[PDB]
């Protein structure tokens, strides 16, 4: 069984991938970690092969390794990166000192997509719903992105896209406000104040909040949803938010309908329900899904949902080599799709 | 608004309730931790007030005091202990050192009521739907008990049932077999193996595997399910486990309607359906619900889900005071219910 691997250097790093996968060659410049592009001669599919750097080389990292590797074996939806391989030349668990991922390979992100691009409200509407398609489906194995963007959305010349990177030198702009109160817990809805601000962006083909530091960001969200009333500012928890808000200028909620003008009139009535500073008033992912805007694609009957994830292992402490072998265990407990 | 609060000893140790809490007297014997009954004068009913014992004394105990005041905020079910107070003598951050938890007092477990008891196939048929409209609730905020059992199943005089201790010197024999694996992740199906061991002994009001030791228990196990087929021994990760089964001398399924004569067929097919030892082939909570040995309860309705539940937290690592402030946040963010 054990398949014929080949050794070969690529980024200062030796790779020991199988024969069956070639044409390795790096990817994204640097972004998503130490991931190269291949060629599966098994499937003839053009793949993306990620190899896990430093694994075990801390309690922090295998921690972090196994953590990964349970996320993705995880992911099965076709909007999501899912694994389609999992290797390792190792044979045994003493071998054992590198993971390589693989799934398939994309075509950009969202970013060299949209940015001062405009697109059609067909080609938005399906973008746009395939973000809360994967949304949907990850919120339900209670799975938080906490971070989505541009750079981890990704589009395959057909405009299918995967939740690349995720979840439970670049900057923020589609980062929900109150993730500035480093709160601990927080809504899901943090995620579809990202999609607000990707939507947005399709449309507009502008940076809706292109905040150039915390408080700058902050002002320009404000600017927008209005200042927080009486009863929302009860919500933040700490003394120095609450009145930093109130500090400020009292700013009146603009009309979305004013702001994105020429644009559908159902996207911004989306918009509106998304974009909202009470993350405990924002529509679900679910909810958004079964919108108008997205009538001409929804499909109750094909919005599934994630199995239960056990997350239980995060709330364990364990050693270096205790994280590494659960993880050897997982790596010879993955089972490639069909 | 700060309440009149007034001190008073507890089994060595200073209780300092409000005035509004009358009557404290300890309970289960020492069971359920510090846990005083008590009567609430503000709606004359009849509560349980446990104290949490010494909560930030150490990393382990912060998170966990977290933990605990966390879970029990958001559990907000019938059939499952919420909170109905938080208090603190403390007036500051700095004063705060205890935590006081109040729910509603309940009449006893289901300890109290079987144990070579036996009830009407009504009785049962109720207690259990209960047992799994708790467990439905609760495995979609993605949390699993682990360890289900009468100790901490309590109903009051009308057959009403809260899952009292939970989740996410006494024995085994309700804990799912797999257990004894020391897994690291579970099927939520681990608790509907507890769900089948307390439902048979409703109906038969006897211990379905009264094992002496993890030895025993497995061999209980295994003489009424049958041993682990081939396909199912790949699933054990461990070469001594495997091997450990193999060992034994294979056992054949027996017959649950052999097993549990005289009680309802209805009953019976659907422990059939939960005492299985693939927990990837059991019956999740909620399709349990719409079988028919509940169809005079059922109700698809009014069976609720939880509210996603982010643990995130657990992720974290930090510092007594830390944790200790967190939960300061989380009990002066309480909202008793209506
Ligand atoms: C946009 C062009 C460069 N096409 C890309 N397609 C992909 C596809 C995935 C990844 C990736 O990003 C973060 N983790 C992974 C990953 C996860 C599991 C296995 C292998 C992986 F590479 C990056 C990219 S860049
Ligand atoms: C609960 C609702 C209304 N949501 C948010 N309420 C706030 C309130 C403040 C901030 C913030 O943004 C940038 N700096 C601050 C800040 C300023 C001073 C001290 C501490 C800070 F965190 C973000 C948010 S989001
Ligand atoms: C069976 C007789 C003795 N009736 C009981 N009724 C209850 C009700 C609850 C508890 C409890 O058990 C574990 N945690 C709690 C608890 C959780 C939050 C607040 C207060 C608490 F006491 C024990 C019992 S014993
Ligand atoms: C995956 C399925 C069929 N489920 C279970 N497969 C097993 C297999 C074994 C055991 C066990 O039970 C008590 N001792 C052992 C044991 C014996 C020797 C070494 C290690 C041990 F853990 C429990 C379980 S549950």
Redesign the interface.
Known sequence: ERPTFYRQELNKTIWEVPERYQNLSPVGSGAYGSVCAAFDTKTGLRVAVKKLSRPFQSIIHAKRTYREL?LLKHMKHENVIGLLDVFTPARSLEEFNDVYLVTHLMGADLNNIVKCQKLTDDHVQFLIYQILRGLKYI?S??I?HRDLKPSNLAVNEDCELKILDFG?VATRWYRAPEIMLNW?????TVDIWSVGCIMAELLTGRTLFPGTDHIDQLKLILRLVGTPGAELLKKI?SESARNYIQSLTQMPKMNFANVFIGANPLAVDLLEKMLVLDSDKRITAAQALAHAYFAQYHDPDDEPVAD?????????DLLIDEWKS?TY?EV??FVPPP
């Open positions: 349970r919120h194995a209670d938080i439970l601990m817990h927080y809504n899901q928890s239960p994830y056990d997350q239980s292992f995060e709330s364990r659960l265990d010879i407990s």
